[PDB]
TrEMBL record:
Family: Belongs to the ubiquitin family.
Record gene name: DKFZp434K0435
Residue range from the parent sequence: 87 to 162 of 239
Organism the protein comes from: Homo sapiens
Protein's recorded name: Uncharacterized protein DKFZp434K0435
Subcellular location field: Cytoplasm; Mitochondrion outer membrane; Nucleus
Residue ranges of every copy of the Ubiquitin-like domain listed in the record: 2-77
Amino acid sequence: AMQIFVKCLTGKTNTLEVEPSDTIENVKAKIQDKIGYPPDQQRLIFAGKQLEDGRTLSDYNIQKESTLHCVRRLRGG
């Protein structure tokens, strides 16, 4: 397990526990279940790259304490 952070709501940084082998799609779904957002059609962003759904966190070298963010932020927290 590793802890990562996501910036998808305007008022709040969410915290997730994930594994390097998790797919981007699964991670996004986990965020979506938690906060209602981002939609499946939106790609997450990490270090200037728009992440592809079928790759894993490890494919992108996403390690403990990384922060991902959404292209658009939902209002709230």
